[PDB]
Amino acid sequence: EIMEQESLWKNPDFKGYNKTFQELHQLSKTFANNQFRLALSNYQSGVNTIMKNRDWVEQYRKEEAEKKRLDEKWYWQKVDRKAREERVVYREKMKAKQDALNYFSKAINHLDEIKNPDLRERPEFKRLLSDVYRSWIMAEYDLQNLPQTIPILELYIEIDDNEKEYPAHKYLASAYSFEENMIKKTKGPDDMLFKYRYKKNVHLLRATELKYGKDSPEYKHIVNVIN
Amino acid sequence: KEIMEQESLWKNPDFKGYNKTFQELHQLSKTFANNQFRLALSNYQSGVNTIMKNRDWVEQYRKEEAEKKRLDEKWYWQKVDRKAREERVVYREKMKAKQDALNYFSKAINHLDEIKNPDLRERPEFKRLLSDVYRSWIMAEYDLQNLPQTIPILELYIEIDDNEKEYPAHKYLASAYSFEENMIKKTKGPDDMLFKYRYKKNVHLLRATELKYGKDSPEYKHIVNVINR
């Protein structure tokens, strides 16, 4: 089930999208809760935003690479053109991320409206919440917004048995590593550097323990790198 | 007419051009039968080879990098970082190739400088090789956006035979002077040169226009109006 864990933790693809939303719409029918229905509607719109943009980027890059440009004769012209194309891609990616996070935010708002504690404990509830947070983490991670994933990942690992998920610890380690490197690169305080390095290592070690097991060749190796 | 042949000389080297140029130059070397010309030709060919090898290497490197699977590259920022690394590898190779090619072009010109007999320096073979070396040098600098550096080489180029009558030489000189004028405006630095760069840009822009379209044509009359406005 490590393959299934890894499959959840990536940018959305066509097959995963169809399986996820078929399963979630089935859960929505058994849950028979209007706020869950609305949260699911918003979550789907957010994933759609992402999928549409990622398809647009691939298509835009293909079209730009397939053009002849016989009037582009110089190296500096190709560099300038590639810089313009990258700026177009970035602007479209940012727009899509903002729209997707607004839909994810609305999905959370609808789940927040489910006040009954018995309903909040339902497996359907926890599954949708997990999916929303995971997609949000992935959308931020895709655009290198690693510090922004830290509070979302922290909320995610609190749900059910989500702390026992090696990818959640892998992304937390990565995000803390980024923060440690940001302290090193700026004129950042040493107390913060050590805090971030420690947290990175805690989650790196936990991720390793989770997928390979304690006292395995891989767990023993990562202990040595930290030392 | 021969405007197509003029335009064909004024670009980065391709295999069509390479084959024609070196077949013709090797034939001229035989008729000239001069050791310094032979050495200048050898250096010129090594310089063009440096460029040809590099432009072939870049295409091959880009193909190999684009054909790799990279199942571990899942994120937008990873692909951007990877493409930025690939572009730095390409840039370092291109600059190195230009540097080496200009050293060979410098040696070619230095060997033709060793031909001291003024009668030999007036030979059509001599002027043809000199023109080819300067032109390749200009194009190799222009490719890397070293437009100010092309100015002394274009000024030497147009001095040779009837080279002043070719419109691309004036087109590149106008472009290079324009770059200099814009550099003064952008850096707000010593402005006492601004009018000199602008004037030179306009002189060559007008001459390029006159050369390919003719004096008192719709295109020549138009350029005159933009300079006056």
3-state secondary structure chain A: CHHHHHHHCCCCCHHHHHHHHHHHHHHHHHHCCHHHHHHHHHHHHHHHHHHHHHHHHHHHHHHHHHCCCCCCCCHHHHHHHHHHHHHHHHHHHHHHHHHHHHHHHHHHHHHHCCCCHHHHCCHHHHHHHHHHHHHHHHHHHHCCCHHHHHHHHHHHCCCCCHHHCHHHHHHHHHHHHHHHHHHHHCCCCHHHHHHHHHHHHHHHHHHHHHHHCCCCHHHHHHHHHHC
Q: How far is B76 from chain A (nearest CA, A)?
A: 5
Please give the radius of gyration of chain A, using alpha carbons only, rounded to the nearest integer.
21
Cα–Cα distance for residue pair A80/A87, rounded to 1 Å: 11
Residue A89: CA atoms inside 13 Å, Cβ hemisphere, count?
A: 22
- A227 close to B (CB below 8 A): no
B90 & B23 share domain: yes
Q: How far is B173 from chain A (nearest CA, A)?
A: 16
A49 & A123 share domain: yes
Domain boundary among A143, A165, A192: A143
Closest CA to B199 of B213, B184, B212: B184
- B143 close to A (CB below 8 A): yes
Q: Using CB atoms within 10 Å of the CB of residue A11, give its burial: 0 to 12 exposed, 13 to 18 middle, 19+ buried.
A: middle
Cα–Cα distance for residue pair B135/A222, rounded to 1 Å: 59
A137 contact residues in B (CB cutoff 8 A): none
A92 & A125 share domain: yes
Cα–Cα distance for residue pair B52/B50, rounded to 1 Å: 6
What length does chain A have? 227
Cα–Cα distance for residue pair B48/B41, rounded to 1 Å: 11
Q: How far is B119 from chain A (nearest CA, A)?
A: 38
Specify the number of domains making up chain A: 2
Q: Return the exposure string of A40-58: e unless at least 16 CB atoms fall within 10 Å of the residue's CB, then b.
A: bebbbbbbbbbbebbeebe
Residue of B nearest to A86 (CA): B80
- A199 close to B (CB below 8 A): no
Task: Compute how many other C-beta atoms are within 10 angstroms of the C-beta atom of residue B46.
Answer: 16
Residue of B nearest to A141 (CA): B75
- B23 close to A (CB below 8 A): no
Q: Are B77 and A143 a contacting pair at CB < 8 A?
A: yes
The answer to whether B6 and B167 have CB atoms below 8 angstroms apart is: yes
Domain boundary among B103, B120, B144: B144
B108 & B185 share domain: no
Which site among B75, B82, B141, B147 would you substitute to test the A interface, given the most A Cβ atoms closer than 10 Å to its Cβ?
B75
Residue of A nearest to B66 (CA): A65
**Largest CA-CA distance found in chain A, in angstroms, rounded:** 68
Q: Are B143 and A86 a contacting pair at CB < 8 A?
A: no
Give the residue carrying structure tokens 């405007």: B3
Q: How far is B205 from chain A (nearest CA, A)?
A: 19
B137 & B164 share domain: no
The answer to whether A84 and A138 have CB atoms below 8 angstroms apart is: no
* Tokens coding B158: 């147009």
> What is the domain range of residue B166?
147-229
Give the residue carrying structure tokens 């309903």: A119
Cα–Cα distance for residue pair A182/A195, rounded to 1 Å: 13
Cα–Cα distance for residue pair A91/A138, rounded to 1 Å: 18
The answer to whether A103 and A43 have CB atoms below 8 angstroms apart is: yes
B139 & B218 share domain: no
Which site among B74, B75, B76, B85 would you substitute to test the A interface, given the most A Cβ atoms closer than 10 Å to its Cβ?
B76
Residue A73 has its nearest CB partner, among B12, B76, B77, at B12
Domain boundary among B144, B160, B181: B144
Q: How far is A25 from chain B (nearest CA, A)?
A: 28
Cα–Cα distance for residue pair B143/B98, rounded to 1 Å: 9
Cα–Cα distance for residue pair A170/B166, rounded to 1 Å: 64
Task: Compute how many other C-beta atoms are within 10 angstroms of the C-beta atom of residue A183.
Answer: 18
- B77 close to A (CB below 8 A): yes
Residue B76 has its nearest CB partner, among A10, A74, A93, at A93
The answer to whether B170 and B204 have CB atoms below 8 angstroms apart is: yes
Q: Are A143 and B76 a contacting pair at CB < 8 A?
A: yes
CB neighbours of A178 closer than 8 A, spacing ≥ 6?
A146, A147
Q: How far is A90 from chain B (nearest CA, A)?
A: 9
B129 & B164 share domain: no
Sign of the alpha-carbon dihedral angle for A45, A49, A50, A55 = positive
- B76 close to A (CB below 8 A): yes
Residue of A nearest to B71 (CA): A10
Resolution of the coordinates, Å = 2.5
* Tokens coding B145: 């956006």
The answer to whether A54 and A11 have CB atoms below 8 angstroms apart is: yes
Q: Using CB atoms within 10 Å of the CB of residue B177, give its burial: 0 to 12 exposed, 13 to 18 middle, 19+ buried.
A: buried
The number of C-beta contacts closer than 8 angstroms across A and B is: 30
B79 & B165 share domain: no
CB neighbours of A130 closer than 8 A, spacing ≥ 6?
A156, A159, A160, A162
Q: How far is A69 from chain B (nearest CA, A)?
A: 14
* Tokens coding B49: 């080879």
B30 & B135 share domain: yes
Residue of A nearest to B146 (CA): A76
A170 & A194 share domain: yes
The answer to whether B171 and B208 have CB atoms below 8 angstroms apart is: yes
Residue A2 lies in a domain: no
Give the residue carrying structure tokens 């706020």: A35
B30 & B101 share domain: yes
Q: Return the exposure string of B187-222: e unless at least 16 CB atoms fall within 10 Å of the residue's CB, then b.
A: eeeeeeeeeebbebbbebbbbbbbbbbeeeeeebee
